[PDB]
Amino acid sequence: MATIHVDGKEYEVNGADNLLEACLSLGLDIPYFCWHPALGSVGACRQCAVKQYQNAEDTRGRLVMSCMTPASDGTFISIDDEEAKQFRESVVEWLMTNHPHDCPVCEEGGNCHLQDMTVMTGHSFRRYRFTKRTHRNQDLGPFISHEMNRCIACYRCVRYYKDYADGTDLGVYGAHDNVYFGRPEDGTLESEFSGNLVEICPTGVFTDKTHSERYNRKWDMQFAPSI
Amino acid sequence: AFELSAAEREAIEHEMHHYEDPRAASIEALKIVQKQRGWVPDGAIHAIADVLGIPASDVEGVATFYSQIFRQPVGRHVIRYCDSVPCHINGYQGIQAALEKKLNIKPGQTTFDGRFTLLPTCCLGNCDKGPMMMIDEDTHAHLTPEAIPELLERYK
Amino acid sequence: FFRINFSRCIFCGLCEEACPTTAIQLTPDFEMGEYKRQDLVYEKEDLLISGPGKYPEYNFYRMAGMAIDGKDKGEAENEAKPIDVKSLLP
Amino acid sequence: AKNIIRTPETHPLTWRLRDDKQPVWLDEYRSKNGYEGARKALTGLSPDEIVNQVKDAGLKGRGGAGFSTGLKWSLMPKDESMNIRYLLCNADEMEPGTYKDRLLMEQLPHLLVEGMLISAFALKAYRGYIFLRGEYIEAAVNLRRAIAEATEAGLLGKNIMGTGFDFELFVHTGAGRYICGEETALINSLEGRRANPRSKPPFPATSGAWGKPTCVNNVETLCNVPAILANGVEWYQNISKSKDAGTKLMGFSGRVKNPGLWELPFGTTAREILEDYAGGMRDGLKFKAWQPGGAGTDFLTEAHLDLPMEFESIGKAGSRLGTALAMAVDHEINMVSLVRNLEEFFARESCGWCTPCRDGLPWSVKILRALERGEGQPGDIETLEQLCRFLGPGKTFCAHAPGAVEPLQSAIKYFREEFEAGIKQPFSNTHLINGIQPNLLK
Numbered sequence A: 001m002a003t004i005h006v007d008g009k010e011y012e013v014n015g016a017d018n019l020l021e022a023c024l025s026l027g028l029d030i031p032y033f034c035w036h037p038a039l040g041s042v043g044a045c046r047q048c049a050v051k052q053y054q055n056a057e058d059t060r061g062r063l064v065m066s067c068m069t070p071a072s073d074g075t076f077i078s079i080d081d082e083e084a085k086q087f088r089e090s091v092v093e094w095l096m097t098n099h100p101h102d103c104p105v106c107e108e109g110g111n112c113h114l115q116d117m118t119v120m121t122g123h124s125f126r127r128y129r130f131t132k133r134t135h136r137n138q139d140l141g142p143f144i145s146h147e148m149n150r151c152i153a154c155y156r157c158v159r160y161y162k163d164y165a166d167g168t169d170l171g172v173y174g175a176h177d178n179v180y181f182g183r184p185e186d187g188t189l190e191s192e193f194s195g196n197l198v199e200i201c202p203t204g205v206f207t208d209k210t211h212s213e214r215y216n217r218k219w220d221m222q223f224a225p226s227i
Numbered sequence B: 001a002f003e004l005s006a007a008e009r010e011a012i013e014h015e016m017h018h019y020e021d022p023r024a025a026s027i028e029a030l031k032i033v034q035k036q037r038g039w040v041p042d043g044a045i046h047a048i049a050d051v052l053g054i055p056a057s058d059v060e061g062v063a064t065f066y067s068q069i070f071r072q073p074v075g076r077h078v079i080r081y082c083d084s085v086p087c088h089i090n091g092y093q094g095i096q097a098a099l100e101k102k103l104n105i106k107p108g109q110t111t112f113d114g115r116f117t118l119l120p121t122c123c124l125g126n127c128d129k130g131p132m133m134m135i136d137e138d139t140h141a142h143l144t145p146e147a148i149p150e151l152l153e154r155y156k
Numbered sequence C: 001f002f003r004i005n006f007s008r009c010i011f012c013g014l015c016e017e018a019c020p021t022t023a024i025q026l027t028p029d030f031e032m033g034e035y036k037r038q039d040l041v042y043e044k045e046d047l048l049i050s051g052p053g054k055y056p057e058y059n060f061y062r063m064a065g066m067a068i069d070g071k072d073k074g075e076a077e078n079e080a081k082p083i084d085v086k087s088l089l090p
Numbered sequence D: 001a002k003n004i005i006r007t008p009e010t011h012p013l014t015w016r017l018r019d020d021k022q023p024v025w026l027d028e029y030r031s032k033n034g035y036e037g038a039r040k041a042l043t044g045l046s047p048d049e050i051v052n053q054v055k056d057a058g059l060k061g062r063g064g065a066g067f068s069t070g071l072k073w074s075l076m077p078k079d080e081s082m083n084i085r086y087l088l089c090n091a092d093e094m095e096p097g098t099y100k101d102r103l104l105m106e107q108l109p110h111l112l113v114e115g116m117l118i119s120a121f122a123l124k125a126y127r128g129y130i131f132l133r134g135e136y137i138e139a140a141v142n143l144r145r146a147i148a149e150a151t152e153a154g155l156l157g158k159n160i161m162g163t164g165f166d167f168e169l170f171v172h173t174g175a176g177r178y179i180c181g182e183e184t185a186l187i188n189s190l191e192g193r194r195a196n197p198r199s200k201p202p203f204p205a206t207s208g209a210w211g212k213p214t215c216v217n218n219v220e221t222l223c224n225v226p227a228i229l230a231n232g233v234e235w236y237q238n239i240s241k242s243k244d245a246g247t248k249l250m251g252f253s254g255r256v257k258n259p260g261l262w263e264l265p266f267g268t269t270a271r272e273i274l275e276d277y278a279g280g281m282r283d284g285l286k287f288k289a290w291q292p293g294g295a296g297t298d299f300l301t302e303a304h305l306d307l308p309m310e311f312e313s314i315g316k317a318g319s320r321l322g323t324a325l326a327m328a329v330d331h332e333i334n335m336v337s338l339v340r341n342l343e344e345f346f347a348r349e350s351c352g353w354c355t356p357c358r359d360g361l362p363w364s365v366k367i368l369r370a371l372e373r374g375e376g377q378p379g380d381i382e383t384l385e386q387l388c389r390f391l392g393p394g395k396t397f398c399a400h401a402p403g404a405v406e407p408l409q410s411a412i413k414y415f416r417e418e419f420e421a422g423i424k425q426p427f428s429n430t431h432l433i434n435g436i437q438p439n440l441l442k
């Protein structure tokens, strides 16, 4: 439908789509968290940053969010722009400042989008030397476990549980960096589709308790397509 | 078990008639119950929700977002001092120290008698007259560490 | 359960290099000859010693943010104490 | 300067202020040519004509950015099907160093009421909301009494001035958050939602409050409308000769001999406001720096005091005009501790929507606190500068952070030596694990 120019190479994409969706569908890799193919685009984590030029002669473009930018015809964007790469790594660094050192004891290890993006952004060195924020967890019933410390405030859970599944017991509480995602009070999630949170959450705040009892890493699982 | 008083219910209802969506009355609804209880009791969140027809998680999010809405018990007279830069230059730090000494508490806690609660606040829109503080709904300007002991006495 | 088949082990130390907890360690010992290969399959009873090994003072649980008996939320290294969303402080 | 004579034409917004500093009420307000502009507009000018006059006058926004009020009113949808429209007054005033709105609302409430009444007719709005901060207790009681007085006089309500125009005005009190000042955040707060900013496009003009055409304007911006529709567009254009037409409530604060705000035309240099009105620094204090108009403005030095108080002049200087309410910093003030205070505010006023502002500002506060405690380590200033560039316009979701780094970048630019004194310790984020030889990066 529309012709875009990513890193010089030209591509034919649907103009009705956003650059993130378009480039991801082209096989191009752009880190992201807040955006979900079914929940739409909001522009919160600011991770899908891409440099956009006004024309082919523009050499000083601007950092835009691919998820909140239309894949319009005549669009010149660069994912490999140094500034874009630096900003995308900085977003991960800011999310890692208050992130718990609990990879070995979390159930998302090896299946974690945050782990995948940290590596994709090439962020392996910590410069932050201050304290990490902590949050007390809640009981969410017999199926979902809570570990708010591992949160990155992408808002995916509240957007799926409340704006897609129309649930009323999950919400975002607090302000600034003390934002909390959970129930207004300890209790069982009442949505018949609460389980999808385990795959929606890009971290390990929401996990599957039914598996946690006999937990095994994704690489050690024998899987089969079943109905 | 928290139960909204008829007066509080009527107040929230009147507010709902001033907006298209009843949800727009949530902030004031939290302020009404607070004016009658000093803070918003945990039971109030659900009760307010039933009156506005909105998820209780939504009412809780608004309360935990807005600072003035208190979700933890507070003293009879809340004391708010401006900690912004204009007042920082004027010398709020001295006023804070004076309040802490006369009250033997620290910013964020209530006195044992439950008469005062020391909470820092942002700009109060009166820097030309700083330092500035607000006790209850009364504003005090041109503050001096020496006047703090007397000012607090007025709020028996 | 923890099982190591020393009949297949090549003593390369890739596993010791991979722990984030310094639990598995290759020790200076070379005498492990056996009569039956089945006895070369060691379990935790034949692996868990009574000391820290080559790494004397490292506890991953003092670095993790997951609360356990002894370490509560905010009691780990470089970790602040939980601030409630209902706190009165701005 | 010390004894300013106020003539209606020279001081259209402060000439009615009483010396007893008591609120001018309907009877007194109408005595001083009150609601005359409303009468002329409601019964005389078409809604479109009023918009054109405000556009021709050149009334720019007085809330921070200088966007043309008339242009903003003209970007409103032209679809007659969209009958339900709203006008929102940003009475919220929580930017540290700003107190101009309090004076107008607490002493001249009918001025805002009249400005909204005229502005609503132009925007064809049926309901108007004054988003007032809760801390302003007096403004609330005063504005509510003014509305009650107006409704009785038939200035607000149904068939206003026998025009068939029905306008209902409501006062919405806030609950503490500063982000509510952002236009889209105000709309969300008004709807009873967490004040998280929205994204544009779409702009609030087409889909704002409850998805209906909405227009947000500052108290001062709206209080400038009555005079234009009463004294004429020509008078407003000739009030001064600056590209920024009209008057502005400007002022100086911060250990100055006479702190306060004064109605002055654009172009008055900061030097005049500091010496002629503020009376200069208090004896014993020497001027070091000054923020042009707000905690979110870039600091300027004494050399920039001879620059006219206009949007373009301060912008070229390297800052923003902002609210035109300047603040003076004396030599006895440490820049690191001052910016630490600014960041502590900007960091806690974040709503938590985007990472750059939610997790980046808190980092800066910790670095600044370490610097002021003498515990700074090499690389701290570089992180601060990187944050200032990566929290700049376009990177964050709204302009809270872009404006939060404005004071920080400026302080490092003119007073780096103060930030350097902080670094006194060697850099170290790792302890020594026994048994593991460390990778000695050189």
Ligand SMILES: Cc1cc2nc3c(=O)[nH]c(=O)nc-3n(C[C@H](O)[C@H](O)[C@H](O)COP(=O)(O)O)c2cc1C
Pocket: D060, D061, D062, D063, D064, D065, D066, D067, D069, D090, D091, D092, D093, D094, D095, D178, D179, D180, D181, D182, D183, D184, D216, D217, D218, D219, D221, D398, D399, D400
């Ligand atoms: C963080 C932030 C805080 C703001 N606070 C205020 C405020 O207190 N008052 C205000 O009038 N505008 C404030 N604004 C600007 C508004 O978004 C908007 O520009 C203004 O209400 C309309 O300006 P005008 O109508 O005078 O043109 C703020 C903007 C930001 C980004």
Ligand code: SF4
Pocket: A099, A100, A101, A102, A103, A106, A107, A108, A109, A110, A112, A113, A114, A115, A150, A202, A203, A204, A205
């Ligand atoms: S959520 Fe992912 S990155 Fe965070 S501790 Fe768990 S596995 Fe590691």
Ligand code: SF4
Pocket: A150, A151, A152, A153, A154, A155, A156, A157, A158, A181, A200, A201, A202, A203, A205, A206
């Ligand atoms: S709990 Fe998961 S989905 Fe929700 S904000 Fe945190 S990381 Fe995102």
Ligand code: SF4
Pocket: C004, C008, C009, C010, C011, C012, C013, C014, C015, C016
């Ligand atoms: S990785 Fe460990 S268990 Fe596996 S062969 Fe090497 S030394 Fe043996």
Ligand code: SF4
Pocket: D179, D196, D197, D349, D350, D351, D352, D353, D354, D355, D357, D358, D396, D397, D398, D399, D400, D401, D402
């Ligand atoms: S910059 Fe981002 S985090 Fe800060 S107030 Fe705006 S939307 Fe919220």
Ligand code: FES
Pocket: A020, A031, A032, A033, A034, A035, A042, A043, A044, A045, A046, A047, A048, A049, A065, A066, A067, A068
């Ligand atoms: S995925 Fe685009 S802003 Fe988060």
Ligand code: FES
Pocket: B082, B083, B084, B085, B086, B087, B088, B122, B123, B124, B125, B126, B127, B130, B132, D096, D097, D098
């Ligand atoms: S900084 Fe105290 S009133 Fe403005």
